[PDB]
Design a protein around this ligand. Structure first.
Ligand SMILES: [Cl-]
Ligand SMILES: [Cl-]
Ligand SMILES: [Zn+2]
Ligand SMILES: [Zn+2]
Lengths: 27, 19, 27, 20, 28, 21, 28, 21, 28, 26, 20, 20
């Protein structure tokens, strides 16, 4: 479950950093 | 991304690899 | 700027809904 | 797309599931 | 409104913090 | 409602505390 | 506490999933 | 029970639906 | 504005990630 | 990395509680 | 110290108010 | 100024780094 929570923050971070380029997420 | 950044704090440059 | 904020909630929603399938996002 | 559809009107979980 | 939906998301987080042990109800 | 009051003007924690329980 | 943090995500999740039905939350 | 059920193991959307109303 | 309030929430989250060890100050 | 995650929730909480006074994080 | 104080045990609203 | 600058137009990470 700790991984699931971290994933939520990870996806938020990618959204900010990647900007116009966008990003991809998979487990 | 899960393997690298959920065991240790990833930096902005490190995370940018998954963009 | 409202589009930028909505995008943040959008990726969080996609993260929960898409699960194992993962997803792609590009503003 | 998703931004046009879900930021102009409230999208449901099922609606959002299409972009997975 | 889409803005209302976004605001609601922040509201429930706020209630979660403020209400503590009492818990809460939310309905749009 | 909470949405009517707090999505039109900024509600404080004390204001929000009314909707607990 | 990890439980307090988990609760925050759970409430966000309930908000999206329950939609118009709304939901209830209490940390017991 | 949601904290006990969903904070020890990952709950699915359907599982979470039990706490709607 | 309520919209300013919501945006601020995202701003503080962003500063937390970007500023890292340096930390930051916030005042509305 | 749990502390880093906790920090994210901490700043969100400080933002709501402190209101007009604002706050500091380091 | 907030990380030391509030990430090991749940801090209350009053406790958090110290960091305002 | 951060609210004025970043809530009226989208601020980047680099732009935001100024308020650190
Ligand atoms: Cl928002
Ligand atoms: Cl968390
Ligand atoms: Zn979290
Ligand atoms: Zn928001």
């Amino acid at each position: 479950v700790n991984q699931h929570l971290c994933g939520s923050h990870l996806v938020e971070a990618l959204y900010l950093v990647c900007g116009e380029r966008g990003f991809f997420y998979t487990x | 991304i899960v393997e690298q950044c959920c065991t240790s704090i990833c930096s902005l440059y490190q995370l940018e690899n998954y963009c």
